[PDB]
Amino acid sequence: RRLGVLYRAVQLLILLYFVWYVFIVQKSYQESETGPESSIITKVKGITTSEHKVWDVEEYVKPPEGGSVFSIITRVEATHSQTQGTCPESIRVHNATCLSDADCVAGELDMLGNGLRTGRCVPYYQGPSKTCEVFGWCPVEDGASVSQFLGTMAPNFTILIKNSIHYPKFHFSKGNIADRTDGYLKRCTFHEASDLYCPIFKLGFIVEKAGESFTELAHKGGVIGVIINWDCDLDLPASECNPKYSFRRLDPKHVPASSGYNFRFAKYYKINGTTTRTLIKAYGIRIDVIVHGQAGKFSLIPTIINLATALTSVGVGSFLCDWILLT
Amino acid sequence: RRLGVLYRAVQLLILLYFVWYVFIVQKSYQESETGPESSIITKVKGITTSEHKVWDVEEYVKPPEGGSVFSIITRVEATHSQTQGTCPESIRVHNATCLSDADCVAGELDMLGNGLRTGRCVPYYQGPSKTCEVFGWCPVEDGASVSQFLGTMAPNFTILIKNSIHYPKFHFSKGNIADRTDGYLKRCTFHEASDLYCPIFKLGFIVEKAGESFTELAHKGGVIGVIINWDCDLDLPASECNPKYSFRRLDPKHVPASSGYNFRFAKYYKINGTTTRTLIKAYGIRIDVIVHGQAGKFSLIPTIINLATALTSVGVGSFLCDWILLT
Amino acid sequence: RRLGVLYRAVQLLILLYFVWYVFIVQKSYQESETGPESSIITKVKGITTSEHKVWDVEEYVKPPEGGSVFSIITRVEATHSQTQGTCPESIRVHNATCLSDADCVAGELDMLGNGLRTGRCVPYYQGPSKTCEVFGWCPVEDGASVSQFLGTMAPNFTILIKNSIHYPKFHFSKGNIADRTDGYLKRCTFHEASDLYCPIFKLGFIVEKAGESFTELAHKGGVIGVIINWDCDLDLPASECNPKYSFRRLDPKHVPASSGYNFRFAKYYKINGTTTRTLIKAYGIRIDVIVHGQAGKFSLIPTIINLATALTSVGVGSFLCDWILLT
Ligand SMILES: *[C@@H]1O[C@H](CO)[C@@H](O)[C@H](O)[C@H]1NC(C)=O
Ligand SMILES: *[C@@H]1O[C@H](CO)[C@@H](O)[C@H](O)[C@H]1NC(C)=O
Ligand SMILES: *[C@@H]1O[C@H](CO)[C@@H](O)[C@H](O)[C@H]1NC(C)=O
Ligand SMILES: *[C@@H]1O[C@H](CO)[C@@H](O)[C@H](O)[C@H]1NC(C)=O
Ligand SMILES: *[C@@H]1O[C@H](CO)[C@@H](O)[C@H](O)[C@H]1NC(C)=O
Ligand SMILES: *[C@@H]1O[C@H](CO)[C@@H](O)[C@H](O)[C@H]1NC(C)=O
């Protein structure tokens, strides 16, 4: 009687749970593939100015080739006319300060120093201190570097990411630009809803979507990641598989020591037969384009496994009801 | 009687379906791992010529280091003796054409322009038009660039990809060159059957296997991906795990706007104390080596799950036959 | 009687096997995700010396930007004052040796040669042999290169890897540096137990943990991979997810032909209006930072599938016991 009503209510509850959670919500009827094959072609385009200098893309984008990882230099500390010679050590180098020649040890190369110590105390670049003389690339950066801010109009720089994926097991291939001939990429601006196949992003848009302040991320540097997630359901048509662009800062923005991004490169010249160089310490924003994939397609093996599990679970509910009735 | 024959025929049909499709075909008795750890070492080697110039690998391969992504330059547009100064704007820049000084706005920096506008109309490099004067790197590329075709013998360039994978969960590690001392790599040519452990590919072979035409992909540029798939069955010996090299074009070859690959780099010089440069716009073929993995090894958990599913399915066939007989 | 004891012993054996192997050992109650999103920021810092030259990071680290793949140059073969002209071919080029002008074919460009053959026999750089004259970058490397060993103090170079992962499906994100303000990274040394969030590694430590000898890996070059495995169990707190750094050599160290790492880059100058260059062949150790992920979190679907399998298996044991008793 009523025992039958409760007995069948348990079965319906178990079947509901399976049909909803296991199948509709979690798609246990589906087999999944992750890690597609991606191709990223980037192209930064924009020009900026300094006190009397004009910087083009060749100057502030390293490396020049358009790939997943590139750095947009927003500030430089250039040390011009560096030659191999003898000069005072940087005041920031461990026990570089000296009062006499006895305080400097000859032939001492510090790995964090700027050269091999000559062994005699020399006046610093700006008085009145005295630092141990070193042989290396001179003058040192910490004594003869001039800072230039490039990124006054870095926010208006535009980056064009060209992505294309492929899912081998499911034979799915797609890109992030629509095959058109209407002059679209020459006048479009990215919008996650209106214009999703115009992957031309301003640097300022990327930074603000990452939650970052451009001045702080430009003076000290930073790393911002442009993440493309192709969470794809292959039972739906190919027009239902779209790229989702997320922006987030990838460097340890909270650790004071490791926050920032910078690197050194030099420009090499022969002046009167002697090799001179211009050491440039570049602070800038590195853009990493990370592509992530998660596909899904209906597979019969998972479906039958879960159906068998549902039947066994309904049987276990049967056993539980009978056991409660007996006791 | 005959009901028994049909009843057991249903069981045999269900068991066949499982034993064939679930186990033999799909290998549901197996656990899978994807995404191994890969190491790619590339080395392009070949020399080409121009009207009176000889180009070596250092000149047309960027970046010089041998990694997954590199570009082989097939054509350049070099603008020599570029200095920071004032010169006419490119005729391709928005509203650069002027008839008088009033048509040029002083201090206007266009992000797609080639400098900061001085504010006075100047004659173009070739008459009779007049363009707004700009301050930047001068002369501009669109007025003083000379094109040189490098890739006359690019098809005979040879790329040596050195790959090595590792599957952590299954403790499988392999490479794409056989440990030999017979002078093999100095005289071998790749063949997907005869010579699969001689990964020395001519650029023309890669292009033709990608279905591309070398002249069009060399003048305008392109991106070709060398895909290595280690679809591996670990129940078989290690000699049964082999690399499969596939070649396909990765750029949007159909979109007119985004088809092609190019980038700019410059050579910097000091001439009479003033920084001059040679801006080179390089059109070439980028080679991406993409390594994809899918391993499989027999695991007891999937086997028992599928066996339980088979037994439950045979029981469901039993129930269906009995239900048909009753009704 | 005793049949009951054996009958229930079989059930307990099957249940033990499941509860131990399927659940406790293999964690079949868990769903897994692999392939997180990684960000790698490297920074090599150290200075070395030669006979009379001091080398800084800008000189021996290529590329300058701090990413996953970079090369630390330990030895160079620099060919200075290379200009486009005519010079003897390298004695190592196929049939380059000549006895008279008839042995040289005019206009012959060998892809493995160093230029276009002029067609007349010229004396070699060192006597008494004679090689076919070529037009290219002259003098050739095999005749005018000078070797300098940089890596006397390469083992004391320190590399700072900055990693940060993210698991999308499980919403887990972590890095490899602890958020601190105690001046930790300026004085810490990595230890896999004591100091795991100080990812500052000496090059010598990386090499010795890889099992390599620094002198051989420095003269000839090599590739060493720094592997970070985030094998993560998400049922445990976030303090229980840690990076595991493994070091191994990635190049074919056993194949004599393919063992080693080297590349060429040049320094370009204008001398009296003619383009000269310094071709540098760099032998060094390439560091690849490979990040691998394997997360796990309790999921109800696998748990119920395995519980149903356990019940079915106990039933199959029931059937086997009854069948043995009947026969
Ligand atoms: C630095 O030099 C001073 C004076 O020569 C010496 O007392 C001190 O120990 C040195 N510090 C080192 C070597 O770390
Ligand atoms: C450049 O970007 C800034 C902020 O990102 C914006 O205020 C400014 O209007 C932009 N420039 C132009 C010409 O729109
Ligand atoms: C270009 O300049 C012309 C004349 O100064 C002006 O009419 C036009 O609006 C300008 N186009 C712009 C600013 O996009
Ligand atoms: C170079 O390649 C082209 C086509 O790829 C071929 O026709 C030619 O014979 C090759 N050169 C040599 C010397 O074999
Ligand atoms: C090299 O040159 C010699 C003499 O000209 C010739 O006999 C030989 O066949 C050549 N080898 C080649 C072209 O591989
Ligand atoms: C540099 O490293 C070597 C071995 O890696 C070691 O013997 C030497 O002591 C180190 N240098 C210093 C100053 O500790």
Side-chain angles (χ1 to χ4, degrees), chain B residues 152-157 202-205 208 214, chain C residues 109 111:
Chain B
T152 312
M153 294 165 285
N156 314 116
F157 293 174
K202 293 183 180 294
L203 189 56
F205 169 87
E208 65 183 1
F214 210 102
Chain C
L109 187 84
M111 283 296 116

Side-chain angles (χ1 to χ4, degrees), chain B residues 39-50 52-100:
Chain B
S39 75
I40 294 169
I41 295 170
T42 57
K43 177 145 179 169
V44 186
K45 180 170 186 31
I47 197 170
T48 181
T49 59
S50 282
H52 204 185
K53 187 177 185 293
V54 167
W55 304 75
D56 64 350
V57 191
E58 187 273 331
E59 289 186 356
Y60 60 72
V61 165
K62 313 277 160 188
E65 311 89 10
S68 297
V69 166
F70 59 92
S71 304
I72 295 169
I73 298 155
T74 57
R75 175 167 73 100
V76 297
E77 303 187 19
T79 307
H80 294 87
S81 283
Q82 269 196 349
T83 197
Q84 279 262 325
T86 65
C87 64
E89 185 68 277
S90 162
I91 198 73
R92 315 170 190 179
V93 177
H94 185 68
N95 72 356
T97 293
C98 56
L99 290 140
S100 290

Side-chain angles (χ1 to χ4, degrees), chain A residues 23 299-309, chain B residues 17-18 309 313:
Chain A
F23 276 113
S299 191
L300 201 61
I301 305 171
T303 303
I304 308 299
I305 290 171
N306 288 284
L307 292 174
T309 306
Chain B
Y17 151 71
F18 268 89
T309 306
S313 311

Side-chain angles (χ1 to χ4, degrees), chain C residues 16-30:
Chain C
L16 171 74
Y17 151 71
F18 268 89
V19 182
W20 203 354
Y21 176 83
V22 176
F23 276 113
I24 290 180
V25 171
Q26 296 277 350
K27 294 182 195 333
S28 302
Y29 61 85
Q30 267 190 354

Side-chain angles (χ1 to χ4, degrees), chain B residues 165-185 187-209:
Chain B
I165 63 166
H166 169 239
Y167 284 95
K169 189 168 64 180
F170 292 134
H171 302 292
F172 184 77
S173 63
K174 208 179 191 182
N176 69 3
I177 294 169
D179 309 294
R180 302 155 69 129
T181 177
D182 48 353
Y184 187 43
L185 289 186
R187 71 185 196 274
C188 61
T189 301
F190 174 82
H191 199 305
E192 76 191 358
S194 302
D195 295 331
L196 192 72
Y197 308 90
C198 170
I200 309 191
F201 313 93
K202 293 183 180 294
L203 189 56
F205 169 87
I206 296 174
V207 162
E208 65 183 1
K209 299 288 95 175

Side-chain angles (χ1 to χ4, degrees), chain B residues 4-50 52-185 187-219 221-327:
Chain B
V5 178
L6 172 80
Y7 170 60
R8 295 179 67 250
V10 164
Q11 313 174 359
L12 276 296
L13 279 191
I14 296 171
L15 287 172
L16 171 74
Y17 151 71
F18 268 89
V19 182
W20 203 354
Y21 176 83
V22 175
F23 276 113
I24 290 180
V25 171
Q26 296 277 350
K27 294 182 195 333
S28 302
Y29 61 85
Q30 267 190 354
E31 65 183 1
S32 68
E33 194 197 61
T34 72
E37 310 167 328
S38 296
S39 75
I40 294 169
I41 295 170
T42 57
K43 177 145 179 169
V44 186
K45 180 170 186 31
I47 197 170
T48 181
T49 59
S50 282
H52 204 185
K53 187 177 185 293
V54 167
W55 304 75
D56 64 350
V57 191
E58 187 273 331
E59 289 186 356
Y60 60 72
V61 165
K62 313 277 160 188
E65 311 89 10
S68 297
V69 166
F70 59 92
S71 304
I72 295 169
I73 298 155
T74 57
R75 175 167 73 100
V76 297
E77 303 187 19
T79 307
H80 294 87
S81 283
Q82 269 196 349
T83 197
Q84 279 262 325
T86 65
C87 64
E89 185 68 277
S90 162
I91 198 73
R92 315 170 190 179
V93 177
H94 185 68
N95 72 356
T97 293
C98 56
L99 290 140
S100 290
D101 296 356
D103 286 323
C104 301
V105 176
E108 172 166 348
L109 187 84
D110 186 358
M111 283 296 116
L112 305 191
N114 303 359
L116 186 86
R117 274 175 194 200
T118 296
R120 64 183 184 85
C121 200
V122 286
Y124 202 45
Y125 307 90
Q126 309 103 10
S129 180
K130 293 181 178 196
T131 48
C132 282
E133 188 185 357
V134 292
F135 178 90
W137 283 100
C138 289
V140 302
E141 189 167 309
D142 295 332
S145 66
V146 171
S147 189
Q148 285 145 273
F149 188 54
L150 287 67
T152 312
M153 294 165 285
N156 314 116
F157 293 174
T158 59
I159 301 93
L160 161 72
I161 297 89
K162 272 141 80 151
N163 189 27
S164 296
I165 63 166
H166 169 239
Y167 284 95
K169 189 168 64 180
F170 292 134
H171 302 292
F172 184 77
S173 63
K174 208 179 191 182
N176 69 3
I177 294 169
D179 309 294
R180 302 155 69 129
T181 177
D182 48 353
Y184 187 43
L185 289 186
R187 71 185 196 274
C188 61
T189 301
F190 174 82
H191 199 305
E192 76 191 358
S194 302
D195 295 331
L196 192 72
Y197 308 90
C198 170
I200 309 191
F201 313 93
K202 293 183 180 294
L203 189 56
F205 169 87
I206 296 174
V207 162
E208 65 183 1
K209 299 288 95 175
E212 297 313 333
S213 77
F214 210 102
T215 69
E216 279 177 6
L217 203 70
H219 280 110
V223 172
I224 302 281
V226 182
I227 297 89
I228 316 169
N229 292 284
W230 302 80
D231 290 321
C232 204
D233 194 1
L234 296 211
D235 308 336
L236 297 174
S239 76
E240 297 296 18
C241 196
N242 285 346
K244 184 183 182 58
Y245 314 73
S246 176
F247 315 94
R248 73 169 184 255
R249 187 164 171 183
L250 303 186
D251 62 24
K253 72 178 299 298
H254 297 298
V255 188
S258 64
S259 83
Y261 175 74
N262 62 7
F263 64 99
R264 281 75 178 272
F265 63 103
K267 289 175 178 211
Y268 278 108
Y269 310 100
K270 295 291 182 131
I271 291 187
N272 203 1
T274 49
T275 306
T276 43
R277 84 169 184 188
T278 297
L279 186 64
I280 302 144
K281 183 187 194 183
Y283 303 80
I285 304 174
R286 193 167 84 181
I287 298 288
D288 312 307
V289 188
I290 312 176
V291 178
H292 199 321
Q294 185 172 356
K297 186 181 288 257
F298 163 74
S299 191
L300 201 61
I301 305 171
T303 303
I304 308 299
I305 290 171
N306 288 284
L307 292 174
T309 306
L311 285 137
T312 318
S313 311
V314 161
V316 176
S318 295
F319 180 28
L320 285 189
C321 299
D322 301 356
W323 194 243
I324 296 169
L325 293 176
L326 291 198
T327 63

